[PDB]
């Protein structure tokens, strides 16, 4: 069936291209990052800005929201994943730790919990840190190209990363070795997300197609593409059901895809520039979307 | 709603500071540095090297990413600055290939490239002394002749090297973005003014396009 969503809110205040956006665990708070150098916490319900966090480096590529909501993370060309404390007794937001140690730019950061964050970098390796001391407890080498995205399983026992080598690797969080090899893309993989079951993930590559990989088969379960769409995917997200797949293309409009029918069923054309980030709430009642236009849009 | 009004007041306090920070950064022009090793990238003028400078009360913020797909992040910069060693003929073709990748990049189709053919002194002496012959790497140099003190032989070679890159530039630019070649040395202090004048014309070509004069 067709899907139509009507930009219930418009989040204005970013003055540069937005690059990443993560929902809070309460499905109401939202952190977004832009090349402006600001990491803004949004009240989705009222479009209020809770915090505005000045970033040391404006070349940010990823943002994260701590599942507890106490901390957010930012990373990019500065080669460092910074951690910010949102519950400071002094009332301001301040950096708690800086996770230096990556040899390339960081493309994705995701908190497993407090004192444990996993980051991916362009140096072809991912690293699992602890924020208490700031030391890489594990490293996940095995990619031959820059790693672009991360997706943590619902149980946070495994995470999946995609790299420019057109391959996606699942990793054992607690043991450190790659457990699965997925390939088939004809160009860079640019966005990765987990199907809510946790036994599958969707890849979005610059070859202008999305594809669904099941950890139990590693085969081409479904291919989401069409002849009239000839541009890559910048972000990929899943709805709470898993039947709806959303992807932010460079044609300036997100496309909603039926994950099982493999046919497009909607479009979220409301941006004047490349859609960069895209994520669905934990509640499933909202769908934020950021783009280089410098506005986020809540779609329902 | 009493607390909501104090939150809505806070958001406007945040928005006021956000706007006041944007107006400061709007007047400062971003520049990206690219080039192969052994070029004068760091001399002709954080995890990634920065360099700010201001000419004629206009501020420039110049970037050099030591640590390409991060190139996408530098979309909507004022101008890319590409530095290449014109003296090393053997690596010149490799630099020529690099300039092709940058010029026809999907996300740089509107970004003008300011090309510096650096270390022109080393090019002059290399062919002035006749120690090495350019025609080994570029057979077409035997057919080229200069259209324009300066020794005739070095000038003939000097303009041939530029012609290779400008031919690469004009083959696909179509006027959306323009390459601005230059010759400079490690001692040339005017390299900063070349970027300033070139950015004025890059801005002008943007006003002409967006005001329907073009």
């Amino acid at each position, epitope marked *: 069936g067709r899907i139509q969503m009507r930009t219930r809110r418009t989040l204005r205040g970013h003055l540069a291209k937005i690059y990443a956006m993560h929902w809070g665990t309460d499905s109401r708070l939202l952190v977004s990052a832009s090349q402006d150098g600001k990491l803004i916490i949004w009240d989705s319900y009222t479009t209020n800005k809770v915090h505005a966090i000045p970033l040391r480096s404006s070349w940010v590529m990823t943002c994260a929201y701590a599942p507890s909501g106490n901390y957010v993370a930012c990373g990019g060309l500065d080669n460092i994943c910074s951690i910010y404390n949102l519950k400071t007794r002094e009332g301001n937001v301040r950096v708690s730790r800086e996770l230096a140690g990556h040899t390339g730019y960081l493309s994705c950061c995701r908190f497993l919990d407090d004192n444990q964050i996993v980051t991916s970098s362009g140096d072809t390796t991912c690293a699992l840190w602890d924020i208490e001391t700031g030391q890489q407890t594990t490293t996940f080498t095995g990619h031959t190209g820059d790693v672009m995205s991360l997706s943590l399983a619902p149980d946070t026992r495994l995470f999946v990363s995609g790299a420019c080598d057109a391959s996606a690797k699942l990793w054992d969080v607690r043991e450190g070795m790659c457990r699965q090899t997925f390939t088939g893309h004809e160009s860079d993989i640019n966005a990765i997300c987990f199907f809510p079951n946790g036994n599958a993930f969707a890849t979005g590559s610059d070859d202008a197609t999305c594809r669904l990989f099941d950890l139990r088969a590693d085969q081409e379960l479904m291919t989401y593409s069409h002849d009239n769409i000839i541009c890559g995917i910048t972000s990929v997200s899943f709805s709470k059901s898993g039947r709806l797949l959303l992807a932010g293309y460079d044609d300036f409009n997100c496309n909603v895809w039926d994950a099982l029918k493999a046919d497009r069923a909607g479009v979220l054309a409301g941006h004047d520039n490349r859609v960069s980030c895209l994520g669905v709430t934990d509640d499933g009642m909202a769908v934020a979307t950021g783009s280089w236009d410098s506005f986020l849009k809540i779609w329902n | 709603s009493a607390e909501d009004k*104090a939150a809505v007041e806070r958001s406007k306090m945040i928005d006021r500071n956000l706007r006041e920070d944007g107006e400061k950064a709007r007047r400062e022009l971003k520049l990206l540095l690219l080039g192969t090793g052994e070029s004068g990238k760091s001399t002709f003028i954080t995890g990634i090297i920065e360099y700010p400078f201001d000419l004629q009360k206009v501020n420039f913020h110049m970037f050099d990413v030591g640590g390409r797909k991060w190139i996408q992040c530098f979309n909507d910069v004022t101008a890319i600055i590409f530095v290449v060693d014109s003296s090393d003929y053997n690596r010149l073709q490799e630099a020529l290939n690099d300039f092709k990748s940058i010029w026809n990049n999907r996300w740089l189709r509107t970004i003008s490239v300011i090309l510096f053919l650096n270390k022109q002194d080393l090019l002059a002496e290399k062919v002035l002394a006749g120690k090495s012959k350019i025609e080994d790497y570029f057979p077409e140099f035997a057919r080229y002749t200069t259209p324009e003190g300066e020794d005739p032989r070095v000038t003939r070679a000097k303009y041939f090297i530029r012609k290779e890159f400008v031919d690469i530039s004009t083959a696909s630019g179509d006027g959306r973005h323009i390459c601005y070649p230059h010759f400079t040395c490690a001692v040339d202090t005017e390299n900063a003014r070349r970027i300033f004048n070139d950015c004025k014309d890059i801005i002008l070509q943007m006003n002409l396009r967006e005001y329907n004069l073009v």
Partner: single-chain antibody, 214 residues
Framework: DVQLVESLSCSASGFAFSSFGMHWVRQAPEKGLEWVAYISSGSGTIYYADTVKGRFTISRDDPKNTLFLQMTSLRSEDTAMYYC??????????????WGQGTTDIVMTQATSSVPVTPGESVSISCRSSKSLLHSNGNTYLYWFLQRPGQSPQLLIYRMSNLASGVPDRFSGSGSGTAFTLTISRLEAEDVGVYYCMQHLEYPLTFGAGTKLE
């Protein structure tokens, strides 16, 4: 850590004073509490109690992190202990978090004046209001404070159910609409004091009478 010292003027240290809206709350020798005034972040909005409206003035100057209160004409009604209280309003914030040491319309009442308590008990406190604090947001703008003898009040519960930071799990507020309760499981020696309830739906911020536990 966080400090608010008074002598009227209030000196702030150890927190981002500019980001907190400030209150003044006064206490006659024994008559409960009364919200003297209120100033928001950036001095955008100012409120006063009906008893001092226009007669008192509240001013705040961020750079030196100091809060002021001035009296146009003193009366015998104003002899009281004056408190400096901070408050910050955003989505999940807890207003009325920290109180100073002190310097020497909705109606809410308490059905209890004083009760004896012993350790290990599960005493509960009660309060009443003249209007439904449950807003359409789903929030209920009720607050709880504990004023131990010789000590300033300290926040226990904000919005009737949320446990304040640095307060043990023992305290647990509850209620719905107009009827409210505050449970103290495993009563301990340091829990003896006067308990005040407050509303924040509309100004002035009317306090309760005060239940003195013994």
């Amino acid at each position: 850590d966080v400090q608010l010292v008074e002598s009227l003027s209030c000196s702030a240290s150890g927190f981002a004073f500019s980001s907190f809206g400030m209150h003044w709350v006064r206490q006659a020798p024994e008559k409960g509490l009364e919200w003297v005034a209120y100033i928001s972040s950036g001095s955008g909005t100012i409120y006063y109690a009906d008893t001092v409206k226009g007669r008192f003035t509240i001013s705040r100057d961020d750079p030196k992190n100091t809060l002021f209160l001035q009296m146009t004409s003193l009366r015998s009604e104003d002899t009281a202990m004056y408190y400096c209280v901070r408050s910050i309003y955003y989505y999940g914030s807890s207003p009325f978090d920290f109180w100073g040491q002190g310097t020497t319309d909705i109606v809410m009442t308490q059905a209890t004046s004083s009760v004896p308590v012993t350790p290990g008990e599960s005493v509960s406190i009660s309060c009443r209001s003249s209007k439904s604090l449950l807003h359409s947001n789903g929030n209920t703008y009720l607050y709880w404070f504990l004023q131990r003898p010789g000590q300033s009040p300290q926040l226990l519960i904000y919005r009737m159910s949320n446990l304040a930071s640095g307060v043990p799990d023992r305290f647990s507020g509850s209620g719905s609409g107009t009827a409210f309760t505050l449970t103290i499981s495993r009563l301990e020696a340091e829990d003896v004091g006067v308990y005040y309830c407050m509303q924040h739906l509309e100004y002035p911020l009317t306090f309760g009478a005060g239940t003195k536990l013994e």
